[PDB]
Design a binder for these strands. Structure first.
Length: 89
RNA sequence: AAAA
């Protein structure tokens, strides 16, 4: 049903938090807090996520079992060494 | 928003 849409959401967000993307993604990194977190609502505004859903609860559901990204409350970060990535605001 |  929505299983395919959730897979697309998960994979897209896992790409944003990949090392390959992060190395050059200064916008994403300058929006991180000191722990590497971004609000999920910021990620939801990225155009490829908007190209899938505007349902925030579905995004949370899609990411619940991700090994690449860590969800903490309303926030998301790369699970591995998130502190490598923040940039000054 | 050259997959912020």
């Amino acid at each position: 049903s929505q299983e395919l849409l959730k897979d697309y959401i998960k994979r897209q967000i896992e790409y944003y938090f990949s090392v390959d993307n992060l190395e050059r993604d200064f916008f994403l990194r300058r929006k991180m807090d000191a722990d590497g977190f971004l609000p999920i609502t910021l990620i939801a505004s990225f155009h490829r996520v908007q190209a899938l859903t505007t349902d925030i609860s579905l995004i949370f559901a899609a990411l619940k079992d991700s090994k690449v990204v860590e969800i903490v409350d309303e926030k998301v970060r790369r699970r591995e060494e998130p502190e490598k990535w923040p940039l000054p605001p």
